[PDB]
Design a protein that fits this description.
The structure is a homodimer.
Chain A: H1 2-12, H2 18-21, H3 40-56, E1 75-78, E2 81-84, H4 90-108
Antiparallel strand pairs in A: 1-2
Helix pairs in contact in A: 1-4, 3-4
The complex binds calcium ion (2 copies).
Chain lengths: ~120, ~120
Amino acid sequence: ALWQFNGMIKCKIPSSEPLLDFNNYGCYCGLGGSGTPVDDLDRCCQTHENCYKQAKKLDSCKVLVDNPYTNNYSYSCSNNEITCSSENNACEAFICNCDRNAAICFSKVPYNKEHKNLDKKNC
Amino acid sequence: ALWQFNGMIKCKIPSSEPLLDFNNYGCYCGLGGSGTPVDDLDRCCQTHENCYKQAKKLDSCKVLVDNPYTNNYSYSCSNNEITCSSENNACEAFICNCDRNAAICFSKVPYNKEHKNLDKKNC
Ligand SMILES: [Ca+2]
Ligand SMILES: [Ca+2]
């Protein structure tokens, strides 16, 4: 769920408020997204979306009435490391990995303030 | 919460249904408890209770209206290992450790069927 994702990002980037810093960044970070990613951080978001798009094409995921961001799952943050729990059933397990990969991607790429809130006439 | 505890025990003892196998075992496993533990597994439960009793004596724990078994926290089970997440605030962090220690204790002691449901006239 959105909330586990926010914590995963803070697990990796302890100094940020992910809901503020990465929201509406580029053509992909935040709600919706189109066009060509503007940078690599924007590319982490595009991949993240494709991963959620894939989750949706799984017979295991077509049971929960809730969205990937409403689909809670369990993980832990320990020594700045993310671990998706084995108690997660198939679908939750797929979403957890999608969020874990994105959180890690965010922490490995440059963040360009000059792309914050981005004029969506560039996407 | 009770539910995270059940999973922690299954994380360590993959073959059991903790709510069935360890419920009402001895003088301490299950609801309430008094007397002298009947065996070591019963002693894991007594310790577990004392840990919850300690949790209650913490200024951090006197905010949540819910019980230690209603007090959800987050952890993950990975390769039969339990990790209490750093996203847990102080109180949840204390309960998580109490449950983790008990789950591990259960998995290291003998289980005597001859103590299942135990006549509470022996406690
Ligand atoms: Ca998006
Ligand atoms: Ca008890």
